[PDB]
Amino acid sequence: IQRTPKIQVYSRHPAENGKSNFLNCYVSGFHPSDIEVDLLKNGERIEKVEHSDLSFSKDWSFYLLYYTEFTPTEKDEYACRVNHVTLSQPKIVKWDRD
């Protein structure tokens, strides 16, 4: 029984151009545990992204947190790109900021 990941993108603090912050991508409810997650800046992979140790919920589905410290500017766009066996194509979830 394969379960597709739920993907949620959020920052640690309100977005303020030129102020240091953390970009998070929480991927959860998936099965099997094999998963590829990248954080993107203007469509390019962010290097040296950190992640929590793999864990699972009561229903045995897996979850992970990916995060990185970043400094947003007015012209930058950020997203989370996820690859899993349940996805025919990678799913890109954008970071929404005003």
């Binding site: 949620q8 959020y10 640690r12 953390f22 998070n24 929480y26 929590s52 995060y67």
Partner: peptide, 15 residues
């Protein structure tokens, strides 16, 4: 209310 989500520093987030 969305799910309560974790932060790398051990605190929580919700939208």
């Amino acid at each position: 209310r969305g799910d309560i989500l974790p932060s790398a520093d051990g605190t929580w987030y919700l939208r």
